[PDB]
Amino acid sequence: TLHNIITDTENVQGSFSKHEFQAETKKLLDIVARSLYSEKEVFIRELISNGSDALEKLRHRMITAGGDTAPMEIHLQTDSVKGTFTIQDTGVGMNKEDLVSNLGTIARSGSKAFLDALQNQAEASSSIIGQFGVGFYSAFMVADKVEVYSQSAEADAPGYKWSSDGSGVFEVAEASGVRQGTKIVLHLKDDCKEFSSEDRVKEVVTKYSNFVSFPIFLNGRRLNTLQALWMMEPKDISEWQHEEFYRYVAQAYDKPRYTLHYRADAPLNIRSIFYVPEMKPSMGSSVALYSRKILIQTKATDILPKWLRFLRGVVDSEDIPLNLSRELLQESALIRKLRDVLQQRVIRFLLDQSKKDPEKYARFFEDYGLFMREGIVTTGEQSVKEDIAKLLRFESSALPAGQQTSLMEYSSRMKAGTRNIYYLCAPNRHLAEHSPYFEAMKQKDMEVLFCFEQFDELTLLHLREFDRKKLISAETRLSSEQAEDLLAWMRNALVQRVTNIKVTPRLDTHPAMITVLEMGAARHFLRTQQLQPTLEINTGHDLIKKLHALKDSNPELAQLLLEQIYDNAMIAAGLNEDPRPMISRLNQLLTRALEK
Amino acid sequence: TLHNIITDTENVQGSFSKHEFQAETKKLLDIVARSLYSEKEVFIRELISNGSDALEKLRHRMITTAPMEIHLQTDSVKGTFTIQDTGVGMNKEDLVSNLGTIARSGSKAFLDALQASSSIIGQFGVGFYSAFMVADKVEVYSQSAEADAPGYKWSSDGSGVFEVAEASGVRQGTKIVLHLKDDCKEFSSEDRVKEVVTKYSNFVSFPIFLNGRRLNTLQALWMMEPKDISEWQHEEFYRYVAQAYDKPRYTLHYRADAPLNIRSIFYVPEMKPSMFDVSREMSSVALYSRKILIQTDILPKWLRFLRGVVDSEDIPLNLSRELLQESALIRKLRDVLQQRVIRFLLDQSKKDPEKYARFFEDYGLFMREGIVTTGEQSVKEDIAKLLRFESSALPAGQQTSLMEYSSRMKAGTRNIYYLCAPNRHLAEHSPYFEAMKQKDMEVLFCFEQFDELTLLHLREFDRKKLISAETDIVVDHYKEEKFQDSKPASERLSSEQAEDLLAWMRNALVQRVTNIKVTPRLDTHPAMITVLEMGAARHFLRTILQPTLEINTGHDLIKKLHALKDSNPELAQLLLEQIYDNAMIAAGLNEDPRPMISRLNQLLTRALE
Ligand SMILES: Nc1ncnc2c1ncn2[C@@H]1O[C@H](COP(=O)(O)OP(=O)(O)O)[C@@H](O)[C@H]1O
């Protein structure tokens, strides 16, 4: 039942023509000026990156041809009356040829050609921003008219003025007295007047350009007072520096409980700092992606797994393949490898923390454990599930209350014969301990992990196996007649509440206790509060004898006592942490009990 | 104190020269192939869109019966991707100018000459070079219509040059063959190509066949008349866009032209939301343009339970068609969508309060989140219109709202009174509600665990302060409010007996309480605990205070406590400690009640003799 029209029927007739690809220059200028970026305001990032590069080139040239130490800076000036934005740098400048060539040719990048000719070890290799040779045109998105004044450091070259409205044509004339470097004046469009506002420009500078190497001045005032901490040697950074830097990058007010300062060169140049905040859950609300100190993404997308989104901080890579918009990354095996690498690194880091300070790590796991569980559930690589699962903490049968263990430790206590991992996911200890399913493998000496946390169950279900070992849920006085009179009677006043009633000798201080056979039911019971309980009675307890003796004497009163015993055992089993519904009834019981 | 170097000092000398902008063509070709689109797969979207526009131009020509379709073929042996449309094709002069010139768009010129149509996708004139992301060799065979014009073959590797030769076996339309580079062989996989078509091009208005098998393309319901869409079509469409297996319980089909062009559909699933999924970062609403998916914010976070689709002709796209421009217009769209959704939900409440109660029960948490996390007061109140409560002035089970509460208020009244309790029996028989019965004010009854937090953050509604019953009771102590006991004097402890009891209680509870006082405001309860800022105290208890214990000297238990303190003083203390614990529980201020149990068991035994 196929329908295909694609058939190999074409044959070349005659001789071929040769052509070269062309460009619709005027339309391309418009696309490059207006259609590259998600935001107009990005022309400021672009113009500042250009000033930086101009300064970096001058710095590079002074290594050999030492000149006059002139200060290396980027000045911005707003004029809210005229509607102008002006930026000036004291860098390398541009003679007439270079203005014509660099500014007049779409995609021509003098910075890229400069980079290509460097020693790979030159400091400038890693800090020159420009590649594509189009960022300058972003100015035309916000300006009706652009004027560029430039003076090169040269053979007494004259200064020049370059000017365009941005519609296919530009003009060049000689000028004086242009200071060494480059001044750019934007005459802002009516709908872009906000960029002649000081406060608005400041917002943009701090967003994208806050860690630019060279001093930025706005109307004569210094902005970028913050050092790119990630580019520094880990041991030259004090804890107070991290605390301040964390607060800044995470927009937080507390301190990091964990700090990881990760540096490496393969698969990419990476300089990074990750923080785990002190404060628990529930814009600066994730790890930012930088490149050569310029923000790429406020919220980095492709470099960390989703389960690590609770990390704050910064990743900077010099050689990460940038999308043309410079707010996205290109699809790349190197970026994928980076994510895998970072995932392993953070895992290793958190593991080391568990050893160094287990108590502190326990606090961490209580607050952030949900992310590990999420990671294990949502990832498809079995090897990855098992790496994240090393971070997991549980409780155990062969261990005291409150004390925690990992799967590896459990794995270390398994007799070399049997090779599978038994767990019981339950609301609490009392419920887990008194599980008939657990009582089975209590006699059969067999350690069982008690998993009390939310989503512990499907975490292990989605985990399936660990350490090539299998995880399987462990779910596969008063005479004797006086008691039976009582049990027959209690079984009637709670017909609509409990499936089963028993007697047990294992009770001491308690008149009764509640047990459950299905942990999944108790959870369904625990979350459903806008079950088949099985209470057991202590025939030696006073309240129970007092009950038996009372059902005949004060039938009304004896049922107050009964429901109290039931509710109390319910509370002991942690199946009723909000006993507000019982209080009035209890106050009635107490009162009737006290005809003293 | 200031450091500037910018000064108006520059002056032009002599004449100027004029210049035309130029382009580094070769590097531009490279930028389109390596740096324009963030994902490689997208070349499929680009070629199919081209095929769609070519068919659209032919469809337009035919106004003044040949099959209009788009065919795809994958050969994993030859490593080829092939697309063929039966559209308008291209002549020599069209082949050279359109394909041979970066930013030249035949499609755009077509649209500019149409002074419907609105279905043409192409404007930038670069989408075609996306083929070089994945192929080191491209062949194009085209046949113009009709027009006594021969076929042609166009060929290039994507660097610098291309060749155009004349050909004979060329069908009306256009055939393009990609010889896939080695790292891109996945696009010779039928299943992979199909994934991509479905992803971006599922609403293209022409049949798409892949290796001879017709793909199940869908109608773009969001662009169609609401009345021409059955419940069944919504069901099916909902299942596609939400990748779900259930059906929508609500459907909002929203169309507007001012202030902004909008074409959208939102659904609320019949399913309860997954609590696991509520905590994940999962996005919920897809964004389209001319029937083509855009990979991208649009809805406030609290509306993330909504599924469906938004399309707006006012959202301009970046060159690679994956970034939305004008972030102020987006927030504006977001603001408009938020308000339209609130209106819709309010109307659903009116239409069917019983169905809305189930919605509020399943999704109420999202409104509560929205109110707590927004800073704008007017936004808080608008969302709060969606909240439901019960009332002391309405029958049990009957739901009401803040606006109906406001509507029943007297002119003189400046407050909205509320009480948080787990259910209506507890609210109605609360010691705190007993106290409020002595005034003539209505009291909202709020049963959900986070209702109180929500009302605390909301703070006021319609210029009226929200006040909890518990708070009001404390405030009355500092006001000359006269209350009378619901039991006559005969049945209460004498003043002298009360002071004596009170003195003994202050001694017996030195550690635990600030004040112990008599209250004339209880009936069936022996005592209560009061705290001025009760709400905030309950919320703070999430991993002591200055509480006050207030006693009902008309309550038999309290009078028995007065007697016990002299007749069996040790039993009195255990009774006193339990009364205090009970009032703490009743106040929702108790810690883990488990250590109270053995104490109570001892107390019970000791009393039953
Ligand atoms: N302020 C400046 N000073 C000196 N040269 C500049 C300046 N701004 C831009 N240029 C030159 O113009 C070229 C094009 O700038 P732009 O379009 O931003 O492309 P790029 O991506 O290379 O920065 C640069 O590579 C550089 O050679």
Ligand SMILES: Nc1ncnc2c1ncn2[C@@H]1O[C@H](COP(=O)(O)OP(=O)(O)O)[C@@H](O)[C@H]1O
């Ligand atoms: N399959 C096709 N049939 C006919 N003409 C085409 C086809 N694909 C591309 N073209 C022509 O080449 C032009 C350039 O295509 P493209 O680079 O995709 O830019 P856009 O689609 O944005 O115009 C199109 O506008 C169209 O005129």
Ligand code: ALF
């Ligand atoms: F200005 Al650029 F890449 F830095 F186009």
Ligand code: ALF
């Ligand atoms: F192919 Al286009 F804008 F659709 F360049």
Ligand SMILES: [Co+2]
């Ligand atoms: Co052949």
Ligand SMILES: [Co+2]
């Ligand atoms: Co080199």
Ligand SMILES: [Co+2]
């Ligand atoms: Co002047």
Ligand SMILES: [Co+2]
């Ligand atoms: Co009125």
Ligand SMILES: [Mg+2]
């Ligand atoms: Mg640049």
Ligand SMILES: [Mg+2]
């Ligand atoms: Mg196209």
